[PDB]
From a paper:
We characterize the binding of IAA to [name]-family regulators from both iac and iad loci. Most characterized [name]-family regulators function as repressors by binding to an operator sequence upstream of the genes they control. The structures of MarRs from representatives of each auxin degradation operon type establish that each has distinct IAA-binding pockets.
[name] proteins were produced from three iad and three iac loci and their binding affinities for IAA were measured.
Residue numbers in the entry:
A (entry chain A), B (entry chain A): 18 to 95, 106 to 155
The structure:
């Protein structure tokens, strides 16, 4: 097979990555959406559905059904919402994901990884 | 929001890309799976489900249900399968996708795009 397809590796890294994070986070009782929604709220501290909905990679009616599973499970509480022993869920989650990122970027320099992410961010400006 | 997440841009380029290709290929009567299954067969000329199933980003029972929609629509025929006026479907498809790739990589050098895809292929070796 040929890369006559400039997005071949975006897609393949994305699929192998999603696959690994599905089974890793099932250790920590989470799916990827659940894990993204917690992390957006974590950086914001207290977040709106509109704001989560920007970054979690989901239209607001998924986020609202996601945030409501996480309300009911004592990981988020509080319009605006905030983390609880979610703060412990995100330690658990990022410990697992840190193993995934460590394996992922092994043998790659800091500058390689930065130039890759700079180039990818130019692809996104262009698609937007 | 912070990239304390080295895959933030893989995922965002992947989501904006999938979004654009969904609506572009609906011009040409195709979804992305249909478009990938045709292209794998095209490079192979005549391909098995096992072989398509490697590259199309789908487990074999999707590919087998995908190849059967494309059998029934005169885009693939022939164990092994091959393109027809599929050969015309792939001109139509890659014309559209070439507009997507042209916009995508605008203002980026050939070497930038190659180094990005080399780095991404190291991420995949590592995840595999
Ligand atoms: O979707 C893309 O452009 C990348 C890609 C991954 N697998 C493919 C198989 C056939 C055609 C393109 C792709
Ligand atoms: O899935 C990833 O690792 C990337 C990513 C995209 N949006 C996110 C929101 C919160 C946490 C991580 C991500």
């Amino acid at each position: 097979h040929r890369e006559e397809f400039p997005f071949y590796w975006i897609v393949n890294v994305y699929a192998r990555y999603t696959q690994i994070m599905e089974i890793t986070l099932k250790k920590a009782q989470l799916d990827v959406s659940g894990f993204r929604v917690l992390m957006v709220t974590h950086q914001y501290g207290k977040a709106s559905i509109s704001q989560i909905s920007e970054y979690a990679m989901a239209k607001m009616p998924t986020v609202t059904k996601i945030v409501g599973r996480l309300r009911e499970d004592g990981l988020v509480t509080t319009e605006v919402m905030l983390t609880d022993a979610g703060r412990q869920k995100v330690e658990e989650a990022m410990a697992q994901a840190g193993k995934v990122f460590e394996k992922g970027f092994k043998g790659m320099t800091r500058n390689q990884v930065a130039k890759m992410n700079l180039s990818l961010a130019k692809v996104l400006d262009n698609l937007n």
